[PDB]
């Protein structure tokens, strides 16, 4: 039942900008999300001090997907463990404890890709989090789908738009509520020529070209969040990427980079079934 | 500016 939102697909209601996504299948400069617009959005929360660490996504009732740099990043002496964090699901407001709406969960085990490259380019920036006890779904809590080879093949094309959400910085003030932005996928060549960093097959970049007029991007605080796309074949939402890295936010001639989820699905499958 | 969450989760 993944990818079908209780307040939208299930009632046959379209959200305010999904049409932009569908019409393309031929957070900075974003906007407030609608209630129940991204029921898989998860907030990585630090106990002490109490603070927003990153975004993440709900892929089942027991598993959360995020960027490995949110948990381990030696250059900044960052190396969190299960007991240092809290996962908050069902949120809209960034700072308010949404009583009766959100659910807070504890972690049982963190799994970081064994080949995550924090030394150079955040290659394989991905991590899975096993919650202690299953979260119950509701109108505001529902998992996103992981893509299969076919879906990945037909959707991950330059020009096709995806959607990014998060409570991170609005400029390079934090938002009051969850922000949302739709961005086009960019050609590898262009991604490669916009930076000095070595780009691998495990990444993809998104954002508007400087001449495209429209703009927008992820920013600090957004890390680990999902880049999703709506399949025009079965109407479900699939997570194609994980907000990973950028050099600035919404810089002209620059683009945000994302972890290519499909390329790493074998590791994801492996873990989930080997550890429940 | 985070609102205090219930201690039951902090434990
Ligand atoms: O301004 C931003 C935008 O940040 C962005 C912008 C767009 C996107 Cl999608 C995601 C992030 C958040 N990720 C990070 O900031 C990660 C955390 C570890 C270092 N990160 C980077 O993004 C590096 C990268 C430098 C080049 C080598 C890889 C790490 N750039 C910076 O530290 C500048 C601060 N971040």
A8: tokens are 């939208």
Rounded to whole angstroms, how far apart are CA atoms A257 and A247?
9
Q: Rounded to whole angstroms, what are the CA distances from A3 to A114, A118, A143, A163?
A: 28, 31, 6, 14
Per-residue burial over A260-276, b = 16 or more CB atoms within 10 Å of its CB, e = otherwise:
bbbbbeebbeebbeeee
Q: What is the DSSP string of B1-11?
A: -PPPPPHHHH-
- The protein residue whose alpha carbon is closest to atom 13 in ligand 1 is A245
A206 closest CA partner among A234, A181, A224: A181
For residue A96, give the chain B residue with the closest CA: B3
The contact set of A with B (CB < 8 A) is: 45, 47, 50-52, 86, 95-97, 104, 106
Which among A182, A227, A250, A209 is positioned nearest to A31, based on CA atoms? A182
Q: How many residues does chain B have?
A: 11
Using the CB atoms, write b or e for A28-60: b if 16+ within 10 Å.
bbbeebbebbbbbbbbbbeeeeeebbbbbbbbe
B window 1-11, beta carbon within 8 A of A: 1-6, 9-10
Residue owning the nearest CA to atom 32 of ligand 1: A247
For residue A164, give the ligand 1 atom closest to its CA: 9
- Best mutation site among A116, A226, A247, A257 for ligand 1 pocket (most ligand atoms within 8 Å of CB): A247
Domains of chain A: 27-38+144-262 (2.40.10.10), 39-143+263-274 (2.40.10.10)
Q: CA dist A11 to A1, A40, A142, Å?
A: 14, 18, 15
Cα–Cα distance for residue pair B6/A249, rounded to 1 Å: 34
- Report CA(A244)–ligand 1 centroid distance (Å): 7
What Å resolution does this PDB entry report?
2.0
What is the experimental method? X-ray
Cis peptide bond N-terminal to A49, omega within 30:
yes
Across the A/B interface, how many CB contacts are shorter than 8 Å? 22
Phi-psi region of A92 (alpha: psi -120 to 50; beta: other; left: phi over 0): alpha
């Amino acid at each position: 039942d993944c990818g079908l939102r209780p307040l939208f697909e299930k009632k046959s209601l379209e959200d305010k900008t999904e049409r932009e996504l569908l019409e393309s299948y031929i957070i900075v400069e974003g906007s407030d999300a609608e209630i129940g617009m991204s029921p898989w959005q998860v907030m990585l929360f630090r106990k002490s001090p109490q603070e927003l660490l990153c975004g993440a996504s709900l892929i089942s009732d027991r598993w959360v997907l995020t960027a490995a740099h949110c948990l381990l990043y030696p250059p900044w002496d960052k190396n969190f463990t299960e007991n240092d964090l809290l996962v908050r699901i069902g949120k809209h407001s960034r700072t308010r404890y949404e009583r009766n709406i959100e659910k807070i969960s504890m972690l049982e085990k963190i799994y970081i890709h064994p080949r995550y490259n924090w030394r150079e380019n955040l290659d394989r920036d991905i991590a899975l989090m096993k919650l202690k006890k299953p979260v119950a779904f509701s109108d505001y809590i529902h998992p996103v789908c992981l893509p299969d080879r076919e879906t990945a093949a037909s959707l991950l094309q330059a020009g096709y738009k995806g959607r990014v959400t998060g409570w991170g910085n609005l400029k390079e003030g934090q938002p009051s509520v969850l922000q949302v932005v739709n961005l086009p996928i960019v050609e590898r060549p262009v991604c490669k020529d916009s930076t000095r960093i070595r780009i691998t097959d495990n990444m993809f970049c998104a954002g508007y070209k400087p001449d495209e007029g429209k703009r927008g991007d992820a920013c600090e605080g957004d890390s680990g969040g999902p880049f999703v796309m709506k399949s025009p074949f079965n109407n479900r939402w699939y997570q194609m990427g994980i907000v990973s890295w950028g050099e600035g936010c919404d810089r002209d001639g620059k683009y945000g980079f994302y972890t290519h989820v499909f390329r790493l699905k074998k590791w994801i499958q492996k873990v989930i079934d080997q550890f429940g | 500016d985070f609102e205090e969450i219930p201690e039951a989760y902090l434990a």
